[PDB]
């Protein structure tokens with residue numbers, strides 16, 4: 001769906017964004033500046049989201065990707081216990097409605113996280129099966145080996161990666177399919193713009209063909225994007241998704257800007273190869289990123305070197321497909337991989353790194369003002385071991401990205417750069433240039 | 438003299454640059470990392486200068502401006518005691534000769550500091566007058582009121598600003614003139630490229646007419662540059678100097694990049710006015726700078742904000758006239774005004790700020806590769822309260838300098854920028870762009 005050419009995403013983990021309504025907080029909520037764990041709650045909430053929408057817009061984003069928000073027992077909310085309600089700590093459906101209306105009044109589209117492979121050990125249907133066993137009307141909605149159901153010391157029922165508090169949904173049951181496909185419809189009826197697929201590789205392609213057809217039938221332009229850490233090609237045959245989370249680009253970029261493992265020749269060859277692997281009409285549905293809730297933080301991956309991290313963002317905003325910033329990374333937050341990357345969002349602007357923030361907005365502005373940067377063909381061209389041009393044509397546009405101590409670039413002599421004008425371009429240490437027309 | 442269009446200066450205070458030969462050190466020399474005072478010696482030396490010439494060249498400089506080096510009792514060497522010899526801690530004339538030969542083999546010209554208004558209280562002629570009084574053959578080479586000569590509690594003889602250890606030279610004596618004009622010849626015979634004038638406003642224009650004629654008669658192309666904290670116009674009538682130390686530009690620039698007192702409109706109006714005050718054929722003899730041995734350090738003036746200081750250097754390297762860097766400032770040294778700015782040069786490269794260094798080299802490279810940046814007419818044009826273009830034409834070239842959080846510049850709509858090509862230019866927070874052809 002074409003609108004993805006002009007999209008810029010901000011991923012939010014709602015428990016850690018903003019505690020607007022401390023009446024919703026649990027009894028043993030912790031302080032906002034606390035160290036995040038797998039078990040503690042900071043009381044982030046949906047009103048916190050409405051109240052800080054202006055920061056999102058100011059950064060340059062016009063789409064949100066939200067991690068789970070339905071009723072659940074954990075702080076991450078991948079153990080859903082009622083798919084038809086907002087978690088009681090997040091807000092009510094009225095709070096949710098109020099968030100949607102403010103979003104549509106700014107041109108901000110919403111994506112929620114579809115967790116259909118599994119649910120929580122506290123869900124009504126799993127908790128009944130535990131209680132009514134083979135007499136339960138929901139016995140077959142899961143894959144339970146025998147009775148009594150036992151989790152410790154090993155679950156006697158199918159689960160997501162062997163985790164006991166996540167029992168596995170039986171998708172071969174038409175009843176389970178019905179419920180599942182009603183989730184996708186119920187939230188589409190509430191003003192949703194699309195769905196991200198939690199671990200879609202743990203189910204089957206026939207299911208996800210069913211899911212596209214129920215989704216695209218509410219509207220063609222609803223967007224489906226698959227979680228996938230490896231090759232995207234399975235998901236882009238035109239029968240499942242519109243794109244994937246582009247972890248392949250993530251590893252190529254950080255390899256070059258942070259690790260030092262890959263030089264620019266290696267970067268471009270991989271980016272062109274990936275472009276050749278991806279099928280026509282699907283390049284611009286790709287969801288591009290440098291980190292998420294399942295990774296260490298960008299600045300931490302960069303060892304605190306802020307200018308180096310700005311090279312990451314420059315390459316991020318140049319690529320064909322839609323770029324996503326993870327909450328806090330724009331303002332300089334640090335942190336190791338989960339739970340460390342699910343720190344609380346600081347709101348006293350004096351603690352922010354505003355130069356990193358303003359760096360990122362500059363790259364957003366250039367892309368937004370340049371059509372070719374949104375709908376151009378992508379060609380990566382290496383200039384140097386330490387210097388690469390990402391060229392976009394619809395009339396070229398091009399971002400050049402230097403990780404060295406300084407350089408000069410001869411436009412007129414690079415055939416894909418030649419159709420631009422200004423002969424030589426000058427790049428400072430860890431420099432970047434953005435050119436057009 | 439035309440060669441000044443292509444010059445870039447590095448000012449060195451030799452006592453604090455590099456101690457190559459610790460045999461020359463005084464008995465109560467201090468450690469190299471010591472806090473500088475008005476009284477202590479670090480043992481910097483001329484061999485230290487030869488041994489680190491490559492750093493100078495690497496920075497992008499091709500002229501040196503050296504503060505006093507003749508025999509003296511202080512660490513600054515403004516109390517000269519024998520004008521015809523290198524201070525015994527600095528080296529010998531052989532060491533000095535060896536420095537000159539290495540300089541000519543790299544295309545590095547030398548300027549020494551002419552201190553003709555006064556000498557030291559330990560000079561042979563003043564020390565004789567103290568001893569032989571009215572029978573001294575040198576009585577009239579100074580302005581001594583009576584005998585016995587007394588300094589404390591107030592000197593009974595003329596001095597530089599009332600400082601007792603600096604007795605004042607009698608320049609109305611033709612003998613003193615002879616000696617003085619032999620200094621200027623003796624060091625020109627040793628391969629010198631020019632002279633900086635210590636406090637030339639404390640003597641007279643007739644003297645400095647004599648001094649030009651003895652200097653320019655050895656060679657036209659020898660350069661004379663006057664110390665002057667105020668208006669340069671007195672010194673540029675074509676009978677005294679080729680230019681001044683451009684403290685007027687210094688205060689205009691730092692006002693804008695560090696103080697916040699002056700906006701870009703105010704900056705440009707002052708730079709154009711100054712350009713209109715300066716006489717034709719003298720613009721390119723101006724010696725431009727952001728600090729010296731008589732000021733606090735650039736980075737200290739900037740309160741440790743390195744990117745802001747890089748705005749200073751960008752404007753410095755764009756101006757008509759020859760830019761000078763003060764030793765250590767390129768590598769990030771900090772310090773208050775004298776003695777604080779006469780810190781020792783660190784040589785373990787791990788302590789250097791190499792991003793500031795590499796920032797400055799980038800501006801040097803652009804100027805060196807662009808003829809118009811060396812011989813172009815200068816016009817300052819304000820774009821914004823926070824954004825200015827320095828335009829140079831011989832075919833324009835232009836550096837744009839932003840102190841704000843980010844901006845875009847419409848080339849085609851600014852008549853002095855219009856003759857360049859690339860329509861809009863993009864500037865990040867504290868950004869800079871350098872354009873040409």
Ligand SMILES: OC[C@H]1O[C@H](O[C@H]2[C@H](O)[C@@H](O)[C@@H](O)O[C@@H]2CO)[C@H](O)[C@@H](O)[C@@H]1O
Nearest residue numbers: 076078160163166198199227293294338
């Ligand atoms: O219980 C294992 C694991 O579950 C959750 O991980 C999610 C992940 O965040 C999703 O993006 C996707 O990859 O599926 C996973 C399984 O639902 C928690 O986020 C994580 O903390 C926890 O260890």
Ligand SMILES: OC[C@H]1O[C@H](O[C@H]2[C@H](O)[C@@H](O)[C@@H](O)O[C@@H]2CO)[C@H](O)[C@@H](O)[C@@H]1O
Nearest residue numbers: 513515597600603635636664730731775
């Ligand atoms: O004794 C006063 C003063 O003398 C020296 O100052 C020099 C100055 O550095 C020159 O650049 C120029 O302005 O003339 C002055 C007088 O010769 C010392 O450098 C300074 O420390 C001292 O206080």
